[PDB]
Structure 1
Amino acid sequence: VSMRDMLKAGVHFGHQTRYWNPKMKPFIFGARNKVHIINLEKTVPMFNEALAELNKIASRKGKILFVGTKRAASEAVKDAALSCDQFFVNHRWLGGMLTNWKTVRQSIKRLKDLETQSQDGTFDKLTKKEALMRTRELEKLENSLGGIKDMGGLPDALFVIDADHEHIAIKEANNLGIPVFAIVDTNSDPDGVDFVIPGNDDAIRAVTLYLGAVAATVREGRSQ
């Protein structure tokens, strides 16, 4: 992504000067209208160097977890993961999604069992109310673990939108040593992101730019 490509999308935009985090000073161009302005001169090379690492991970058969819980951007992140055959979390992050992997696997098994059971049959054997209740549970599990049913094991890389909002995920990752790739607004604490991208995390246009560029490079890394 080129600085012009970002700037038109508005990547330079930030939170209010009232709400910023201390470690973000190096990445901040300045202030206008009491608004923090992010410096694309740092943003572009760091994003490119992160894309290099993401391409490397995906080119060694890496499993990638796209992470974002914004109600606006949930579907964008889900489609972003689907466009590169990867795994995602688009609904509220659940504590222990990575650290409590065994429980998630048991929940994955129940979701797999319910979908297999409906195809196999025995719903007719169940009472119509009972069969409907089983369908409701299957729908709820599909809404929740739709992205990670096929992750199989712990992912090899994480992509995070608004790292401050998803702070539990990054704490878990660091506890596991799983690398964190994150779009970091001025209000976030950048310590947990090993490849940090400072940029707007709310705006739909810039978020979609991040996701599309990452997914293009991930498909490229897969293709070899």
Structure 2
Amino acid sequence: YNVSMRDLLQAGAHFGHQTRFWNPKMRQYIFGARNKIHIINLEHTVPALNDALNFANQLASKKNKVLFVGTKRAASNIIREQAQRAGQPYVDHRWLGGMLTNWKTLRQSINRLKDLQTQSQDGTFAKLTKREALERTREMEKLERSLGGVKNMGGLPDALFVIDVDHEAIAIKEAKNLGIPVIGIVDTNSNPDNVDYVIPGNDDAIRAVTLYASAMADAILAGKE
């Protein structure tokens, strides 16, 4: 399930942000700048990506869970489709504060979320009139978009995967607080300090996020033990 290197170049993982927005911690990985924007070498990208795939494969073999996290407008549908394909839940929309550090309250949220979904499946929602029914339906989309991923979880995920560390810094802080390992793609302008498995590459490119999510979903599915 390795990504070779040529796939990374054809996707465009080497492109990064402008030199003026860089984070000095990525000096080792940047390797140079072709233009006023940084270009990261894939020679460092491929081994870390393969190691992340291996770790995810081992975790899936042990049947432990890897949560998906992508919120950017570019990678939202990518994490949508690939996490649905892999059967590993996700945080597609805005990362609500305290998901992991305040799980005791979110268990209740998942609770009447599931109860109202079961009511929608049942004929209970058929009895009441149209206005109140539409009110509860609006409540249903409102709750589902925020907590659609978390309903499957029965506990804290064993690992996290992150599309943008800066954009999902709150999730990184929560994972550091509770000790969950994090694998996230870290761009030029990003801080890799709290990421256990640092895979450096572009996160704006739809091709790049598609490649990353597809490869990780392939590894998770190919655990198969």
Residue 134 of structure 1 and its aligned partner are, at CA, apart by 1.1
Report the equivalent of 1:101.
103
Q: Mapping of 1:20-35 within 5 angstroms? A: 20-35=22-37
Report the equivalent of 1:66.
68
Residue 75 (structure 1) aligned with residue 113 (structure 2): no
The 3-state SS of whatever aligns with 1:97 is coil
TM-score (norm 2): 0.96
Q: Determine the C-alpha separation between the residues in 2 that align with 1:122 and 1:214.
A: 40
Residue 129 of structure 1 and its aligned partner are, at CA, apart by 1.1
TM-score (norm 1): 0.96
Q: Determine the C-alpha separation between the residues in 1 that align with 2:208 and 2:31.
A: 18
Residue 121 of structure 1 and its aligned partner are, at CA, apart by 2.6
Decide whether the 8 Å contact of 1:182 with 1:197 is kept in 2.
Answer: yes
Between the aligned residues of both structures, percent identity stands at 73
Distance of aligned partners of 1:120 and 1:43 in 2 relative to their CA distance in 1, 3 Å threshold: same
Report the equivalent of 1:51.
53
Decide whether the 8 Å contact of 2:165 with 2:172 is kept in 1.
Answer: yes
Residue 141 of structure 1 and its aligned partner are, at CA, apart by 1.5
**Amino acid across the alignment from 1:83:** R
Q: Determine the C-alpha separation between the residues in 1 that align with 2:144 and 2:94.
A: 14
Report the equivalent of 2:15.
13
Q: Determine the C-alpha separation between the residues in 2 that align with 1:134 and 1:87.
A: 25
**Which 10-residue stretch deviates more, 144-153 or 81-90?**
144-153
Decide whether the 8 Å contact of 1:50 with 1:181 is kept in 2.
Answer: yes
Report the equivalent of 2:215.
213
Out of 134, 137, 149, the position equivalent to 2:151 is 149
Residue 119 of structure 1 and its aligned partner are, at CA, apart by 2.4
Q: Deviations over 1:38-92 (max 9, x none)?
A: 1211110011111111111111111121101011211110111111110101101
Q: Deviations over 1:14-34 (max 9, x none)?
A: 000010111111111201211
Gaps of 5+ in 2: none
**Amino acid across the alignment from 1:164:** D
Decide whether the 8 Å contact of 1:65 with 1:158 is kept in 2.
Answer: yes
Residue 122 of structure 1 and its aligned partner are, at CA, apart by 2.9
Q: Determine the C-alpha separation between the residues in 1 that align with 2:4 and 2:122.
A: 51
Report the equivalent of 1:189.
191
Decide whether the 8 Å contact of 1:88 with 1:148 is kept in 2.
Answer: yes
Q: How well do the aligned residues superpose, as a CA RMSD in angstroms? A: 1.1
Decide whether the 8 Å contact of 2:8 with 2:208 is kept in 1.
Answer: yes
Q: Determine the C-alpha separation between the residues in 1 that align with 2:94 and 2:141.
A: 16
Q: Determine the C-alpha separation between the residues in 2 that align with 1:188 and 1:98.
A: 23
Out of 79, 83, 86, the position equivalent to 1:84 is 86
Q: Deviations over 1:91-111 (max 9, x none)?
A: 011110111111211111121
**Amino acid across the alignment from 1:100:** N
